[PDB]
Design a protein around this ligand. Structure first.
Ligand code: NA
Length: 50
C-alpha cells in the first residue's frame, strides 16, 4: 500500500524504454517493494492519466 513517487515513475519509464515490456519481472527487479504486476499497472497509468 505504498504510494508511488515521482522518482519511481521516472525510473519505471526509463526501465521500460530500455528493456521493453516482455518481462515485467525485469522491470520490477529495479523497483524495491514493487512487483511485476504493480509495475505494469503503474506504467499503464502513467501513459494515460486516468
Ligand atoms: Na521490486
Amino acid at each position: 500500500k505504498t504510494r508511488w513517487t515521482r522518482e519511481e515513475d521516472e525510473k519505471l519509464k526509463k526501465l521500460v524504454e530500455q528493456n521493453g515490456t516482455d518481462d515485467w519481472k525485469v522491470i520490477a527487479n529495479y523497483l524495491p517493494n514493487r512487483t511485476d504486476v504493480q509495475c505494469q499497472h503503474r506504467w499503464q497509468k502513467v501513459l494515460n492519466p486516468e
